[PDB]
Amino acid sequence: YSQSLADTLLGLGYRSIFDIAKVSRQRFIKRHDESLLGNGAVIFDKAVSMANQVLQKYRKNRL
Amino acid sequence: VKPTENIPSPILVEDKYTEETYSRPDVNFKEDGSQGNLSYTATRVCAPMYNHYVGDKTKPKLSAYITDWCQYDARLDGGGSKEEERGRGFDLATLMQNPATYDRLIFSFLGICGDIGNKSKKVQEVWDGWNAQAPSLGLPQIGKGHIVPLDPYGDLGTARNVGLPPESADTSIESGTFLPYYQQNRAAGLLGGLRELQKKAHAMGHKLDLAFSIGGWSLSSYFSALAENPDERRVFVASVVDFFVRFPMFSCVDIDWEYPGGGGDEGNISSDKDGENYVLLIKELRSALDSRFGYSNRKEISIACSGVKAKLKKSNIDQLVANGLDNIYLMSYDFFGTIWADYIGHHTNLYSPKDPGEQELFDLSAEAAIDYLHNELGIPMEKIHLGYANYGRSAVGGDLTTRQYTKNGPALGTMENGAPEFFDIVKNYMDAEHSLSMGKNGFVLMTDTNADADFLFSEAKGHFISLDTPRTVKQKGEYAAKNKLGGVFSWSGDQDCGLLANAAREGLGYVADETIDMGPLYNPGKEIYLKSISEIKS
Numbered sequence: 187y188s189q190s191l192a193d194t195l196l197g198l199g200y201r202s203i204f205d206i207a208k209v210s211r212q213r214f215i216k217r218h219d220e221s222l223l224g225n226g227a228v229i230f231d232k233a234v235s236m237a238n239q240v241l242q243k244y245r246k247n248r249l
Numbered sequence: 250v251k252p253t254e255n256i257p258s259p260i261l262v263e264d265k266y267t268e269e270t271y272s273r274p275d276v277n278f279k280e281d282g283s284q285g286n287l288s289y290t291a292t293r294v295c296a297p298m299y300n301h302y303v304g305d306k307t308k309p310k311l312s313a314y315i316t317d318w319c320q321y322d323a324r325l326d327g328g329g330s331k332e333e334e335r336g337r338g339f340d341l342a343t344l345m346q347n348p349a350t351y352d353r354l355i356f357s358f359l360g361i362c363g364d365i366g367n368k369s370k371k372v373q374e375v376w377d378g379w380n381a382q383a384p385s386l387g388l389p390q391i392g393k394g395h396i397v398p399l400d401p402y403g404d405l406g407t408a409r410n411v412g413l414p415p416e417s418a419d420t421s422i423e424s425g426t427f428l429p430y431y432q433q434n435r436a437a438g439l440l441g442g443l444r445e446l447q448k449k450a451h452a453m454g455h456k457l458d459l460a461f462s463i464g465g466w467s468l469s470s471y472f473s474a475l476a477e478n479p480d481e482r483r484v485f486v487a488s489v490v491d492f493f494v495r496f497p498m499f500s501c502v503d504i505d506w507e508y509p510g511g512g513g514d515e516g517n518i519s520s521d522k523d524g525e526n527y528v529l530l531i532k533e534l535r536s537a538l539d540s541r542f543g544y545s546n547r548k549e550i551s552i553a554c555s556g557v558k559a560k561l562k563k564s565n566i567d568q569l570v571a572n573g574l575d576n577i578y579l580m581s582y583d584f585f586g587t588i589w590a591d592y593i594g595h596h597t598n599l600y601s602p603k604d605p606g607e608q609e610l611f612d613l614s615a616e617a618a619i620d621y622l623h624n625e626l627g628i629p630m631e632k633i634h635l636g637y638a639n640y641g642r643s644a645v646g647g648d649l650t651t652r653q654y655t656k657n658g659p660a661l662g663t664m665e666n667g668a669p670e671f672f673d674i675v676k677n678y679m680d681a682e683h684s685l686s687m688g689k690n691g692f693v694l695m696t697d698t699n700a701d702a703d704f705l706f707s708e709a710k711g712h713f714i715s716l717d718t719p720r721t722v723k724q725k726g727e728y729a730a731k732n733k734l735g736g737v738f739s740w741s742g743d744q745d746c747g748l749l750a751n752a753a754r755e756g757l758g759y760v761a762d763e764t765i766d767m768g769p770l771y772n773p774g775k776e777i778y779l780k781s782i783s784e785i786k787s
Contacts, residue, residue, distance in 0.1 A: 187414065187416065190414040190415075194449075197346070198449055198452060199449075199452060217448070217452075219436075219441070220417075221414045221416070221417050
């Protein structure tokens with residue numbers, strides 16, 4: 187089923203999961219219908235973790 | 250267009266349907282023309298597709314109406330994809346990836362309790378549904394004059410082709426158990442896809458305006474009960490308040506009574522006095538809606554005017570202007586139709602040949618109405634909006650020097666006893682490819698030296714098709730811009746894969762520094778002397 191999100195979440199809603207670094211939970215929760223919100227309340231437990239997952243990939247290089 | 254060339258696209262999307270649809274058991278489409286009263290070619294196989302432009306809104310607003318069945322046919326069935334119903338390739342996806350395509354949409358429709366004009370039986374079985382499930386839920390039963398939903402399963406139960414994920418499908422919404430779904434918080438089907446679009450348009454940038462229709466040509470019976478007497482008005486106005494309480498997303502509601510004189514089918518009802526009772530009905534509603542919903546976010550009200558000079562008098566705008574009316578919709582079309590005129594003719598046009606022939610609907614034009622409306626009724630052009638069809642009108646046995654017609658011949662179109670669309674016309678009869686406006690496979694393309702409109706014709710028994718073109722639409726938009734209109738509106742928005750809708754943005758002057766281009770395909774057709782009937786009597 188997951189590609190039904192990636193067609194339109196990535197089609198218009200957000201450019202990428204990295205741009206979810208904008209949000210606060212109530213801002214994010216407001217925007218979504220039952221077909222997202224009924225399969226979306228878990229997202230910020232790993233997606234805000236994604237929003238700090240690139241962090242040292244361009245600084246661990248300090249040597 | 251001094252000696253200049255252009256080049257075609259190698260494909261026109263070419264998805265599933267049409268290439269197999271050609272063989273289907275009542276698709277009687279001769280590329281030479283026919284009396285074949287049915288044919289079913291899908292929209293997505295002659296498709297040029299849409300293009301982005303700078304959308305600066307200081308122009309006449311480009312808008313569209315919508316109807317809920319693609320394979321449209323009298324006495325509808327369950328299911329789809331199999332002749333009785335089909336989507337015609339109209340998935341909402343082509344608008345979901347182009348949310349900026351229209352400046353307004355106009356939805357349709359609601360029934361009314363006791364209104365045999367919409368339907369006496371099946372809609373009133375949905376009303377029997379309300380008046381059985383509601384008291385079981387402790388909710389109120391509703392009396393005559395209240396609004397009612399048309400098809401709860403088809404409206405809110407279905408999920409395919411409305412741009413929803415498959416699991417959104419909700420099968421319980423039959424006539425005995427549906428009222429709990431009847432608010433925006435439970436929006437599904439197309440009523441989900443519209444609400445979804447309003448958010449997505451704003452999420453990428455700019456908003457969308459959303460009106461809805463009640464009534465029409467066979468659908469204007471109980472308006473003569475409703476308007477005439479307060480005891481029907483109260484239940485109705487309370488039901489409009491209850492609708493905007495249930496569904497705040499809509500911006501506007503319009504009655505489509507045909508007509509304040511007589512107008513429509515014999516199922517419709519009108520007294521002479523209903524042309525005044527309608528002014529009371531709308532002022533009472535305007536007052537109740539102003540009371541409930543204030544002014545900073547109030548819901549708009551507009552009218553459907555006749556394009557016929559006698560009937561724009563009966564429409565009584567010069568009283569409504571003083572009682573409260575936002576916009577005036579010039580539906581100046583159906584000036585021809587396949588069966589009911591004694592001679593071949595044209596659905597409308599910009600410029601009459603000189604005179605309305607035998608004082609008929611034919612040989613009229615859009616030039617005639619505004620000259621009276623702006624001056625003898627005094628109307629601002631910024632209230633006036635110009636309506637147009639997105640299809641052709643066929644006839645048979647035609648001759649161009651005498652306009653005589655085979656008196657009861659139901660000439661070819663799409664669907665079933667209905668009009669041919671332009672995509673199936675370019676697929677078979679007409680050049681959109683090779684630097685001249687002309688016919689192909691044995692059709693010809695004509696231009697009347699009297700009115701300057703175009704039409705297709707054929708040299709068998711005499712197949713004829715009145716139709717619009719990229720040329721005339723490129724002109725109508727530049728005309729409408731100079732003629733100061735509040736807007737222009739399509740009918741119905743499911744009927745163009747981008748052939749004339751590109752030409753509308755290009756006609757109104759939306760731009761960017763393309764899927765296809767048409768310069769040497771804006772030249773005219775064969776300059777025929779298609780006489781008015783007065784010029785055939787002379």
